[PDB]
Amino acid sequence: SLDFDFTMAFQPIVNCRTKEIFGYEALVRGLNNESAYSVISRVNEDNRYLFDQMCRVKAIALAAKLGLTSKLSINFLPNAIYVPERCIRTTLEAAKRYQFPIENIMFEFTEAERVEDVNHIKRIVEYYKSLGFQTAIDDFGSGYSGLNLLADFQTNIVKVDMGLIRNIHADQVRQSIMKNCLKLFSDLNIQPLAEGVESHAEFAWLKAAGVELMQGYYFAKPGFESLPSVNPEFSEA
Template sequence: MTDFPTSLTGGCAGCKNAPELNFDFSFAYQPIVDLRDQSIFAHEALVRGVNGEGAQSVLERINDQNRYRFDQLCRTRAISTAAQLGMREHLSINFLPNAVYRPELCIRSTLEAARAHNFPLDRLIFETVESEQLDNNLHLTHILREYREFGFKTAIDDFGAGYAGLTLLADFQPDLIKLDMALVRDVHRDRVRQAIVRGVVTMCTELGVTVVAEGIEHAEERDFLADCGIYLMQGYWFAKPAFKALAQVPPGAWQNA
């Protein structure tokens, strides 16, 4: 999809009243791989300090006054940097649901950035962090439905770790859910985690939702999850986030344990 809506006008209170940020930030990009053809499906944009400092050095500066501006800049900057790096795969961007007032208006700067950099809308994935406590779950599902209408893919991050869980999945079925790494860690050794993962995969298969396993650090985790039917994966086993760059997956990451 390369068409861009042109009918969005006006703005909301958040657009007009949000103060400028008094700090700067950048991004690192980590690949999400597809085991089926040993390719890169997407790159997730992960916020970093301007010199590559960890995400917490940036996120600890977010408050109720600058949350909206930060969320908007994250989207537009992730797109512009990805375009400069020549990204051809999907781009996954985390967003803060509590920073979105009216999705049909708050998305305008994202659409403008995509248009300016000729980045197709159907290659954009918006991840909501399930572990962020939400003021209104209905508001989140409204955002996700609006984003789907624009042609974006949607994802629930950290599935199984946060506040929304199965209730959110019952209200809205995203394109992707990302299993929380706490479920992935040492899953090949843990019978309980294995049962939970298999249950999630069965449920999502029936709902038409693709499961992504994140936090893969060992070949044994990769292989067990692949046997469960999960083919999209992310984690240090494949590549660490690359600061202002697109990480490459080494050939050994695909080899049998």
């Protein structure tokens, strides 16, 4: 073990077709709502497995304490940790003590590590899918999270990076990128999710294009140790 402490904020993912909440992403904060980066910047190589586990337990315990009945999304620590089976029971144990279905837990793989050689996140994704977890590719269209991931394995969901979503209602290039990626997603039976939606104009274009799942300040900012309600402008039109 116990070097430093932190907690979670939660940000809803909204199904714009049914206007209900698909789930919440768990986002780490310091005890006074300090930033995620200011917490993760204290995570080094020696306490990576401890911090990984504590994030998982902390997100599961808080979501359950707050009464989350939809999905809980947890970023998988990008550091390609090994023996994917080692300390997966620490996540299985936590979900059992809070009676939280494995099937309601989605791990988001945000590949952005030091070495561009680690395709064996495929081993981890296929293992986690075998236990019943949902899976997502995070930050698709940025960093390392690219087509190279889709080529070798497919997750339930792909979170399109907010760089690709910003101002898309009037950016012809991003429009074409998204149009052709959605058909790719459809061909791969993968569900899209647009992240970082900030304005109604982006929302309205994404929804016409066929995206149902969306996340962003437009719907709700992350809520410190709380499960935010979603913007009235969208939930009543």
